[PDB]
Amino acid sequence: MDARAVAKRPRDPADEDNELVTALKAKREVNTISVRYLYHADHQALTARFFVPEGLVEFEAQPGALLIRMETGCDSPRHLYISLYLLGIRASNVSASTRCLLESVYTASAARAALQWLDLGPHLLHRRLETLGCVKTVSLGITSLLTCVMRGYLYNTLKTEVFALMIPKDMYLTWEETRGRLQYVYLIIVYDYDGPETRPGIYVLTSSIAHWQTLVDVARGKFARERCSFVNRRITRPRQIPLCTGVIQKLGWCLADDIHTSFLVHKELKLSVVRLDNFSVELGDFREFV
Amino acid sequence: AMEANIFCTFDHKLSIADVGKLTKLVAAVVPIPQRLHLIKHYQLGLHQFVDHTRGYVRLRGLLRNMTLTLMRRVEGNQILLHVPTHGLLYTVLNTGPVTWEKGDALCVLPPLFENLLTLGQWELVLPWIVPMPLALEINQRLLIM
Amino acid sequence: TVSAPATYGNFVLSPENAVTAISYHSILADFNSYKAHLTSGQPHLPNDS
Amino acid sequence: FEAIFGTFCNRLEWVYFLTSGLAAAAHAIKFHDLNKLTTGKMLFHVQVPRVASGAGLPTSRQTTIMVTKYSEKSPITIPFELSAACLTYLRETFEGTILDKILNVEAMHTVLRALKNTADAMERGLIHSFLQTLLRKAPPYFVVQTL
Amino acid sequence: RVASGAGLPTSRQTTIMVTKYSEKSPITIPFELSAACLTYLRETFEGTI
């Protein structure tokens, strides 16, 4: 170590020639493969590749769909990858007309299998779900390939276009009149304990609050009826041991001015969505509240 | 240019078989008690805490405080350990008893059950890497038991 | 009519081979060629022993 | 003692698309802006001949036929991998001892072998894709002979 | 390797390393001579035809 070594500012990652160019220059050998520029070499987002059967890929052809991993309770597929739209079928929050529309969209054996597996078991819904991230690609086929980011912005190969996050309009939720400049977005699953069986509500919440306790206090204010239902079931129906009235999972952050309303088209049917233009994913785990 | 790493020197003589054993573990999660630049091999692993009158839950409490690091490179006279940073991707070895799936969330647990690097009185006791629901089930079952 | 070798070939071990045979019970034929090519940087030897 | 009588390596042979006789069916062209192109097409204009008819028969009116043909895309791909050990020794010199030089040379040769292997694989894949396209468009003997 | 079409599985790089060993088989043949033959080969008596 010496003074000049300390003074020297670090090398620019962009002005050093890459390893392949280094080797070719060292031997002074030509190659057919273009090598001077490496694509995705400066993508800071972390991505993964997922295989999914043809029946499940609908409304996820467009980039920006939220991707969930669901448990089948079986050893043959073990896990399936489904979108928030498919969960729209099961959620009580979604209206009748939209439910009919996106139920007519998912008329495939795989989607119906997913629904049967979801309703079959005795567990609560959130125990069967694991969130992966947002998708931005599609290669269609009998088995389709989806690439999903799990930490970062949504953009194509050259960053020449940034993708948004699409939320169906019935699931979108806000609790403040004037938005804070920075918004955090959360996934909420809340259970209503009626007589026969629990009806789950599914929401995506955009909020300025980052503290857990304040956020959960606001949520308990907004969902008082479901807490009353939880206590009522605890009283009337012993030997049923419910847990939780709802769970909250954090996934992402975006600016308030990026929020917009839009529609999605698939097989000449229009679904209306809320659109988070420059959304960047940052996943948390399910935290439960009562 | 190098990346930042932590150096570990073995205070015991190593045969070729021992170093050949170490290089098999070139991506395992090694717990370390303190963030320190140079350490001796006794500090590696959980063997330093092992006790006859204490058990699982105290080891869990201690593992809460330890620093997790990944073994990066094996050489003569020294070991290179890399301490991971939040938000970056890394390669880890499934030393646990259970297979993994894409999207799984893993958490570290004390081992419950081949032995690695039996030196004169020290052993490389690595922890368990397990998906979260299994860890919850194990904790509840053990507490009830 | 065909040309054939008139006599057997001869294989001789080098003194470096003697040292390695004594110390490690092993022989590497053309040891010096391997050494020279390794230190010079060539990947390929011209022919086998 | 044990003896080692030489060490041998696979002398791989190289295949080129333009050298194969299958290339006779192709008309190969390089186009640097191909990634920006969406679709390409050609258009044909045909006017048919006709023969004058006798009395009492319907006359054949002149007709023109327009057809167009579109292009189809079929990209190919293949990966190759490098280890972090290869990458660190490719661009580092620890004290410059002869063992370090050996390791640098090994990293360089590793990446060079990978590049050559991948280029050969790309040539073979081009041949494979072209053959698959030709088989896709080619009908069997009984169809064409019936026609 | 052959490059595959989009969506198909790709071919991993593969290195195969093989060793081959030698075998041994000696041969022998005897010949014999008589005591009288050795006597007349080694020594001679009073010189005569």
From Swiss-Prot, chain A:
Keywords: Capsid protein, Host nucleus, Virion. It comes from the Viruses. This is Triplex capsid protein 1. Disulfide bonds: none annotated. It comes from Human cytomegalovirus (strain AD169) (HHV-5). InterPro entries: Herpes_1. GO terms for cellular component: host cell nucleus; viral capsid. Belongs to the herpesviridae TRX1 protein family. The lineage of its organism: Viruses, Duplodnaviria, Heunggongvirae, Peploviricota, Herviviricetes. It holds the Pfam family Herpes_VP19C. It is found in: Virion; Host nucleus. The gene is TRX1.
Curated annotation (Swiss-Prot), chain B:
It is found in: Virion; Host nucleus. This is Triplex capsid protein 2. Interacts with TRX1 and major capisd protein/MCP. Structural component of the T=16 icosahedral capsid. The capsid is composed of pentamers and hexamers of major capsid protein/MCP, which are linked together by heterotrimers called triplexes. These triplexes are formed by a single molecule of triplex protein 1/TRX1 and two copies of triplex protein 2/TRX2. Additionally, TRX1 is required for efficient transport of TRX2 to the nucleus, which is the site of capsid assembly. Belongs to the herpesviridae TRX2 protein family. It comes from Human cytomegalovirus (strain AD169). The gene is TRX2.
Swiss-Prot record, chain E:
Signal peptide: none annotated. It is found in: Virion; Host nucleus. Homomultimer. Makes the hexons and eleven out of twelve pentons. Interacts with triplex proteins 1/TRX1 and 2/TRX2; adjacent capsomers are linked together in groups of three by triplexes, heterotrimeric complexes composed of one molecule of TRX1 and two molecules of TRX2. Interacts with scaffold protein; this interaction allows efficient MCP transport to the host nucleus. Interacts with capsid vertex component 2/CVC2. Interacts with the small capsomere-interacting protein/SCP. Belongs to the herpesviridae major capsid protein family. Self-assembles to form an icosahedral capsid with a T=16 symmetry, about 200 nm in diameter, and consisting of 150 hexons and 12 pentons (total of 162 capsomers). Hexons form the edges and faces of the capsid and are each composed of six MCP molecules. In contrast, one penton is found at each of the 12 vertices. Eleven of the pentons are MCP pentamers, while the last vertex is occupied by the portal complex. This is Major capsid protein. It comes from Human cytomegalovirus (strain AD169) (HHV-5). The chain holds residues 99 to 147 of 1370 of the full protein.
